[model samples]
Target: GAAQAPIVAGHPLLGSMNDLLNDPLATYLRARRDHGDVVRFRAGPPGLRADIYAVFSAEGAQQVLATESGNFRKDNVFYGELRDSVGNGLLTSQDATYLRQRRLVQPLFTRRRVDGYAGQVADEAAGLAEAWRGIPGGGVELVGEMHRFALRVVGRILFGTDMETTFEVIERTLPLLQEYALKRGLAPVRTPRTWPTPANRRAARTQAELFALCDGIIDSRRNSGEDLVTLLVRAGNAEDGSLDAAELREQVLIFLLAGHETTATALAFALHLLARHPEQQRRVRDEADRVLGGPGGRAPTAADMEALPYLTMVLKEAMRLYPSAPVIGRRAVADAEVDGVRIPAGADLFVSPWVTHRHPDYWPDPERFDPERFTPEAEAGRPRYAWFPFGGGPRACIGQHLSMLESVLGLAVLIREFEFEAVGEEEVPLGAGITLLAKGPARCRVIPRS
Candidate 1:
C-alpha cells in the first residue's frame, strides 16, 4: 500500500500484540527505527477495527497539531479511563464544554497568579528537602519524593489540605488505571472490578476513596474562604449566580491531576538528568545560587524566576527529553486535510512530543541532554511547533504557567538543600496512564551539600 513504511507489519498481529504487551516504549522506539517516520499497522482484531498510526518525524507531528488545528478533535483513546476520574474537565472535555471550562480556569493560571504561588511551591519543596537531611548517601527513589512534594504544593495553594494523606489514595488508584487501560486497549475486556483479582478490587476501592477525599475538600471549601477552590466556586457560576456542583468537581479533578503530576514528572526527570550529568547539574546549581544570592539561600520568589534564565532552560530541556504529556491524540470530528493529506472523519490523530522533540532534522544530537538548545539564540532557528512540551493553540494545557513556575521553584529549593546521585544502570521506563511517568521506581542517592 502507498501508506506502508518499512516498520509496517514486521510480524503478524499476534506477535505485535505480545511485543506491545511486554514493553510498549521499546516497541514504539523500534517501530520508528525500523519503519521510517510514518508507520501504520493493524493492532488487534480485524473486525474490531484496530489500527496504529505513528509519526516519528517532527514536521509530520507539528502539521497534525499546529498547522491543521481545526482538522482535529481531542481523541479519547489515550484518555478513555481518565474520563471516569476527571469527568469532563479541561483535559477530557470537548468543543463548547471544553472551551467554557478553559475560559473559567484560564484566568486563575495567568502569569501573575501562577507566579504568586511560588512561595507555597518553595515552602513545600523545602519541607521535603528537610525530610531528606538525615538520610544516608545511599540511593534514594526520588520519583515518589518529587510526586509528593508537588502534591503538597498543589494542595496548599489550591485546596488548603495537606497532600500527605492523599498519597495512599493516589498510590492505589494510578497503577490500576495504567494496567487496565493499556491492557484493555489490546484485548478489549470488561473491568472485573468485583472479580477476585486483588488489583482490580483494590483499584475500585482506591478510586472511590479518592473521590471521597475530593468531596471532603469540596465540602470544607464551600464553607471556607481561601484557596483556588473558593475562587472557582464563586467564579464558575451561572449568570443567575448558581454554581454547578458537577462542573466544579470536574474542574477540581483536573487540578488534582494536572496541577501536580506534570510538574512532579518534570522535576523527577530534571533531577535524574542532573545526577547523570554532573557538570550540567553544577551549572544549574550555580545559576540558582547566583540568582538567589548564595548558599543556604532564601527560597526563590515568583519575581526571582525571571532572573534565573538557566534554571528555566534546564527545566525546558528536561521537558523536551521527557515530556510528561508526550503523545497527544486527537480525532477528526470532520473530514479535513493536513498538509494535503486527506484525513477522514473519525480517524485518530496523534501529535507526539516524544518523537517530535528528538526529530533528527530539527534537533542537533537530539538524543543528548543539552539545556543550551533552549537558549533564545538557538530557539530562534527552530519552528514554533518544534518544542511543545505544553502543547500549542486553543486546547493547550491550561496550567502551563503554573507547572513551569512550580517546577522552577521546586528545583531551586531542592538544589539548594541537597544533591541527587543516580545509582542504577537501568534507565527509568516511560509509560502513560493520563500523563507520562516512570514505569518503575526512580531510585537515587540524596546527599546534603554545603
Candidate 2:
C-alpha cells in the first residue's frame, strides 16, 4: 500500500512532460515542492512500463551518486539519446570500457596539463574581445555566438584546426539534436520509426551529418601529430586501448557537446545575471581591469586566472544558480536505501543541482545572486554537496576543470570588452535537452566599456 501510494501519486508523467515541453526548471521545482525529494512515477505508458522516476534531495543525492558502481546504471534516456552521436566515449560507455577510457583521458585534463592550454585560451579570449569591438551597441544574439566562440577556442587549442567547417556542422546539428532530445524525454518507447514524422526525419538526417563530421575529424587527425584529436588517435591505438571507431565517436561528440554547450549556457546565464545585477557586473569588471591591466587591455593568462579568485567565485556562483547540466540521472540495479527510504531496484533516480544548489536549507537567501557564497571563507561553512554545479562522485563531469577555466576566462574577457544590458528576463526563455539553454535567441546590448 505504501509503495503504490507514492508510486502512483501526483499524475506526474503528464506533469513531467508538460514541464519538460514547456519549462523544465519549473517542473523540477514543482516536483520537489509537491512530492518531496524522492518522488516516484511510472516512466512509460501504463502497460509497456519504462521505469520508476526517483528524484532525490541533498542526502538522497549523496547515496545515489557516491555509491558502488554496479548498484546503479547510467539512465538510458541520457545515454541512449547521445550515444547515437557520441558513440561509446566516456560519457556514454559503461563498466570496464568507461574505466579504461577515463584512465586514458584523465591525465589530459589534469591541472598541469590543462595549464599548458591557457596561452591558447588567452589568445582566443583576446580574439573574442577584438571581435566584439565591431558589433556596436545593439542587441547581440549570445547563445549561438558564444557556442561558436567556445567551439573555435576548443578546436584551435585541442585539434589544431580552425572551426570554420566544424562550426558549420555544429550550427546545422545542434538545434535539431536539441529538439529531438526534448521530444524523446516527453515520449515513450523511444518514438518508433514507423511514426516517420517530419521532425523525426529531420533529426535522423542531422544525426547522420553530425556523425560524419566527427568521423572525418578523426580520420584527418590520424596522421596530423598535433592537438587533442591526434592525441586521442594515438591513445585509441594504445596497447590496451579499448576504444574503437564507435567509441572514439562517442568521446569526440561528448567533448564537442560538453565543450561548447555548457560554456555557452554559462556565459549566457552569467551575462543575464550581470545585466540584472549591475553592481556585481561592475565588481567583476573592476576585478578584470585589475587582472588584465585595464579595460579591454591584455588578455588573461593562466597565471592571471590563479590571481583572480573572485572571478572564479563569481562564475561558480553563477553556475550554482544556473548549472548548464542542471540534472543528473541514475537507475538502480538492485534495492537500496537512501536516508531511511527504501529505493527498490530499477528506479530512475534524478539528482537536480538546480534545486539543491539553491535549496534554502543549505544556502542563505538562495534566490539572491551572491558570489560570496563560493568564497573560501564562506564556502567552508556549507555542506560539501550544498553546491554541485559540476556534480560529485566518479561519474562527475570529467571536464569540470576545463569548464571552469573556460567560464572564468570567457567571463573575464567579456567583462573587459563590453558592458552588457538585458532587454528583459522573459526574452531569454529557458529550454532543456541534454543541457539547459535559452529556448529562443537571448538578445543583450553590449556597449564597449570605455
Candidate 2 residue 442 Cα shift, in angstroms, is 3.5
Encode model 1's per-residue lDDT on 322-371: one tens digit a residue. Answer: 88887777776675544334455776756677777877777888889999
The lDDT of each candidate is 0.71, 0.72
Pairs with backbone N, CA or C atoms under 3 Å apart (clashes), candidate 2: 86-250, 87-250, 158-228
Cα distance off (Å), candidate 1, residue 402: 1.1
Q: Which ten residues in a row have the lowest lDDT in candidate 2?
A: 1-10
lDDT of candidate model 2 versus the reference: 0.72
Q: For candidate 2, write residues 354-431 as lDDT tens digits.
A: 888877778888878888887788888877777776777888887777777777887888888788887755356676
Candidate 2 regions exceeding 4 Å error are 1-20, 42-45, 48-51, 174-178, 191-204, 236-239
Residue 290 in model 2: lDDT:
87
Judged by TM-score, which candidate is best? Answer: 2
Model 1 ranges off by over 4 Å: 1-7, 77-80, 161-163, 170-187, 191-204, 237-242, 335-342
Residue 289 Cα positional deviation in candidate 1, in Å, after optimal superposition: 1.3
Worst 10 residues of 1 by lDDT: 1-10
